[PDB]
A paper describes a structure:
In this paper, we present a strategy to fuse specific, high-affinity protein binders to obtain multivalent or multispecific scaffolds of predetermined geometry. DARPins are used as building blocks to confer the desired specificity to the construct. A series of rigid connector modules replacing the DARPin capping repeats allow to combine the individual DARPin domains in such a way that their distance and angle can be altered to test different geometries, bringing the binding partners of the DARPins into a defined spatial arrangement. The two helices are not just joined end-to-end, but instead the two domains are made to overlap in such a way that the joining helix is stabilized by contacts with the domain cores along its entire length.
D12_H15_D12_H15_D12, the construct with the longest shared helices, crystallized in space group P21 and the structure was refined at 2.4 Å resolution. Indeed, in the majority of the D12-containing structures analyzed in this study, the D12 paratope-paratope interaction provided the largest crystal contact, with a total of around 1700 Å2 of solvent-accessible surface buried in the interface. Similarly, in D12_H15_D12_H15_D12, the N-terminal DARPin interacts with the C-terminal DARPin of one symmetry-related molecule, the middle DARPin with the C-terminal DARPin of a second one, and the C-terminal DARPin with the middle DARPin of a third symmetry-related molecule. The rmsd for the comparison between design and crystal structure of DDD constructs with H06, H12 and H15 ranges from 1.5 to 4.2 Å. Considering the elongated shape of the DDD molecules, which amplifies the effect of small deviations in the connector, they agree remarkably well with the designs. The structures of these DDD fusions are very extended in one direction (>110 Å from N- to C-terminus), and thus amplify the effects of small deviations in the inter-domain angles, making the agreement with the designs even more remarkable.
Residue numbers in the entry: 13 to 491
Amino acid sequence: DLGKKLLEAARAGQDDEVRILLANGADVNTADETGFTPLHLAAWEGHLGIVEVLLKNGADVNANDERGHTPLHLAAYTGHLEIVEVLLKNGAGVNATDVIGTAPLHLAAMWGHLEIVEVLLKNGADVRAQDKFGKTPKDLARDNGNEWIRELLEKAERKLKDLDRKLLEAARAGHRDEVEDLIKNGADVNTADETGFTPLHLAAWEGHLGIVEVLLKNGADVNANDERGHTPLHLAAYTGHLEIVEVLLKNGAGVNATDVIGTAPLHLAAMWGHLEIVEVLLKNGADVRAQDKFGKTPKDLARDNGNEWIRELLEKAERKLKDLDRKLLEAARAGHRDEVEDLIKNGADVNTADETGFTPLHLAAWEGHLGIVEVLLKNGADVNANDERGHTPLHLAAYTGHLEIVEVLLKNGAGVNATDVIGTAPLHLAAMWGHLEIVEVLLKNGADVNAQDKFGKTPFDLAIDNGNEDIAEVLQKAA
C-alpha cells in the first residue's frame, strides 16, 4: 500500500520522492514481513539524506526487526560512519543486541571499521559485552586480524579492570555511592578477588543491604561460589544479617548450598544462634537432615552450642519428616503411586528403613509395584540396600517372580551376586521357585552358577531338588 512504496523508495536512493509519500500520509514507521523499516533500509544502503529526513519526520531510531537488529546494527555492519553518528545523536541504542547477543560494537570490531569503534565507545559502548559464543568485540577483532582495533579495546579493558578492583573495595567498605558510580562506568558486578569473593559476598558479609540490592539489580550472581564453595547466603547466615538473608532468598539464592566441608546456611545459622534466620531458611525449604563431613546436622550443632530454642524448633521439623518417611513406607508397599511422589516432594527420604531394614524399594519390588520402583530409582533410592539379613531388592524380585522389576534393578547397577547371611543369591531363589524367565536374565548379567548357600546347594541343585527340569537344563548348559 502507501507504506510499501516507501520502504522500496527508501532503499532506492530517491531523496525527492521520499517527500511525496510522507506528505501524502505514508506512515514513517511501516514494517515489512521480516521487520525492516524505512530507517533500516536507508541505513543499510547508506542513504544519509533519506535517514536524516526520516528522523525529522519522527522515525523510531531503536526500532527492532524479526531478530532484534536496529538501524545502528546495519550502519555498523556496512561501515557508514556518518549514519552511525546521526543515529547516535538521535538516541540510538549503542548497546542494543540481536537475538544472538551481537551488538553494534561487535560488528565494527569484526569488519575493521576502526572509526566507528572510536565513535561507539565515545557514546558509551560496552567493550566487555559477550555474544552467544562468549566472545567480546576484542575477541572478534583478534580473530579477524584487526590489530589497531584490538589495541584500542585492550586499553579500554585494562582500565575497566581497575574499576573492578575498586568495586570490590567499595562493596566491602559500604560506599553505596561509589558502587553505583563504578557500575555506571562499566565495572563488572560479577568480578572476583583471588579467593573467589565477589562484591556480593563482601556486601553480604559486611552487612550492606543497599549495596547488596544494587548489585542484584545489575545482574550479580546470587549463587556464586568462592574457592571453597561458600555463597553469599553462607556469609549472610554466618554473620546473622537477617534482612540480607531475606533478599538473597527472594533473588534465587540456593537455600541448601554446601561448601567443601558439607556446611549449609542452616548449619551456620543454627550453630551461631540466629533464630529468625533459622525460621526464614526453614520457611524457604532448608534440609534439616543435611550433615557435614563430621556427620553433624544443624540440630546437632545447636545442642552442641547451647542454643535450645533453635534445638527444639529443629526437633519438631525433624519429627514431622519422620512421619512422612513412615507414610512413604506404607505408600510404597500399597502401590499408591501418586501418594509416593507427593511425599517425596514434601521431603520423604527414599532411603528410610523400618525395624527390619526394609526400604521403600524393598517393599515395592516385593509387592510387584513397578511404577513405584522407577520413581524410587529416579530419585536416588539405594538399589543395593541390605536389610538386617542381607536381602536386596533384587532378592525380593527374584523370589516373588517379577520379571519386569528384575530387569529394571539390573538396569540400575543392582548387585547380581549378592548373598544374604545364609548364602542365598537371587539365582538360588529364581531357580528354586521356578521363574525361568528371571533365571535367563540373571545369567546374561554374570549370575554365578557355582554359588552355594550354607547347605552346599548351587542353583542347579535347587532346580533338581524342586523338580524344575527346564531350568536345570539351562543351568546345565552354562558352567
